Write a new protein. Structure first.
Lengths: 63, 250, 104, 102, 99
């Protein structure tokens, strides 16, 4: 049970764009872009981690 | 200071659907099934909880007021913190500040955040009878599973240790949600608009039987709030001017 | 007609051990019984498939005590799954397959 | 092969909604309905003459926070024509039509 | 900003067939023995075509597009969310359906 996903409220319903200030809109856009960048970086690094896990000892755990 | 339990039903005027990653399979959008593949579909409480949390946040910002420019005083951090409980800006010192934080921020107390337990708990809605679910969205279009029109869905929430202002905020959120009482996804195809009612019953601990404070009925033709106690809760939340929603922590 | 001169016969009789190998591919058994499939049991078959990958690692064969212990545990949990196949003929086919693997 | 269909004269309850609708886009929706009234055809089987249908539709807005909605009016689409009531809806159409901000 | 609900009835003057795109049966409202229903997909497609005809006759920060194009505002593409939602048409009484 549970499941689902937390999501960016601001891309689901757009009435909130009329609530947020322009500076806050810029902050939101920066948040979205930087989280996309972090997402791709973390996906790459976690794929590397998974491949290393599939490779196989104490030194490996330290790494 | 009371514990409120909402017990009632949701008659789905339209089919009700939800796209849960674990529930949806290669076959298509299948509702989560409450057990194995051959158990009864249930509408997850996560969807209703998100919808009512956003209703709460929207009523909070509306009561806060909008400037002449038409924007709310809150910043993006406070919006995210109220709605999704995420410490955007980013303990023993919060051990006793939690009560004050709840007092000044009814919403964050009602719906919790990381480390702060939410007073409101919104459960899973489950059909009463059987065969109240089918496949919709014909078109090559992958059909999605959903409930049926008129499906009676047994829903139950419980606010634990709700002050007058917490329950007032929750009832106000329900009032606002009754404007567009829509759950789940597929707003296109209008899948999600419902017609629900709940019996609000409190249970003073120690008592053998709870007492029904009244009824809240949501219909497309209006909202019926019966029982003076619910009106008192709403008026307590509305008339209060001692809320500071510009707060956070961890 | 011909003669056979095995040079490096020590390597021959050592490599027999690599060739003294009949592998029970759990993925192959999973794919084989796709109609008489007690899908509830599939998790076990995947879980053991994970453990093998953890123990076998990158090796085509490993005889460590972990390996034989996992062999026994996997075959016991597959006898567990054996009482889940619905079709009696399929149930007996599966039971005979795992029994043959056990005696082998 | 034979098909299954609603019998003539059948009455079906139908609900639609426009989320947080603005005056202009909801005016466009009303204009789309008005133009659909000229050829009120649903489904397929056009060769079979299927699709001809009429409808009546109470349009009600609901400001969030109020306990009841306010009935803006109704729209009736029939082969006799289009019938619209309520000053709000007419104002909305008159706002959509002269919108040069598209 | 106002949220609009269009609630009412559809009267049928001639047999309404749908799902032209084993035998041809109407969409079933759950299971196999419940009532049938008219698919909202067809209705939304008709409304989309009508709006296209009307506009042709007349003629996260990206939300200006819906301010620019009311058509994509109402219905929306895969990316942008659609403002409009077109339910299904459910029979009120029994029968009202035949072979």
């Amino acid at each position: 049970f549970g499941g689902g996903a937390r999501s960016i409220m601001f891309q689901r319903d757009e009435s909130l764009m009329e609530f947020l200030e322009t500076d806050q809109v810029d902050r939101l856009e920066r948040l979205l872009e930087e989280q996309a960048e972090a997402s791709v970086d973390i996906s790459q690094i976690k794929t590397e981690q998974d491949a290393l896990k599939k490779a196989m000892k104490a030194e490996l755990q330290i790494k | 200071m009371r514990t409120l339990n909402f017990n009632g039903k949701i008659s789905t005027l339209e089919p009700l659907t939800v796209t849960v990653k674990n529930a949806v399979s290669t076959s298509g959008h299948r509702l989560p099934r409450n057990g194995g593949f051959n158990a009864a579909p249930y509408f997850p409480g996560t969807s209703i909880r998100g919808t009512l949390r956003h209703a709460a946040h929207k009523v909070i910002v509306d009561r806060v007021g909008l400037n002449a420019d038409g924007k709310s005083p809150f910043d993006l951090a406070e919006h995210f913190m109220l709605a999704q409980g995420v410490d955007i800006n980013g303990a023993p010192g919060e051990i006793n500040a939690g009560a004050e934080l709840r007092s000044k921020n009814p919403l964050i107390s009602l719906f919790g955040r990381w480390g702060l337990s939410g007073k409101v708990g919104i459960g899973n809605a489950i059909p009463d009878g059987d065969n109240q679910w089918g496949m919709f969205g014909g078109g090559p279009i992958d059909p999605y599973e959903a409930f049926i029109t008129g499906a009676e869905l047994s829903h139950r929430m419980s606010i634990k240790n709700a002050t007058d202002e917490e329950a007032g905020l929750f009832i106000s959120a329900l009032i606002r949600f009754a404007a567009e009482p829509r759950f789940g996804g597929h707003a296109n195809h209008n899948c999600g608009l419902v017609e629900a009612h709940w019996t609000v019953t409190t249970w003073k601990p120690g008592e053998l039987v709870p007492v029904t404070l009244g009824e809240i009925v949501i219909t497309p033709n209006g909202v019926e709030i019966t029982g003076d106690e619910l009106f008192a809760m709403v008026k307590a939340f509305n008339e209060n001017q001692s809320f500071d929603f510009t707060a956070r922590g961890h | 007609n011909m003669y056979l001169i095995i040079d490096e016969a020590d390597i021959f009789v050592d490599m027999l051990e690599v060739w003294k190998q009949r592998r029970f591919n759990l993925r192959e058994l999973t794919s084989a019984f796709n109609e008489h499939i007690p899908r509830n049991g599939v998790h076990v078959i995947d879980q053991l498939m994970n453990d093998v990958t953890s123990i076998a690692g990158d090796l085509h064969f490993c005889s460590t005590p972990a390996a034989v212990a996992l062999f026994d545990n996997s075959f016991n949990a597959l006898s567990k799954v054996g009482r889940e196949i619905k079709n009696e003929a399929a149930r007996k086919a599966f039971f005979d397959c795992i029994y043959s693997w056990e005696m082998l």
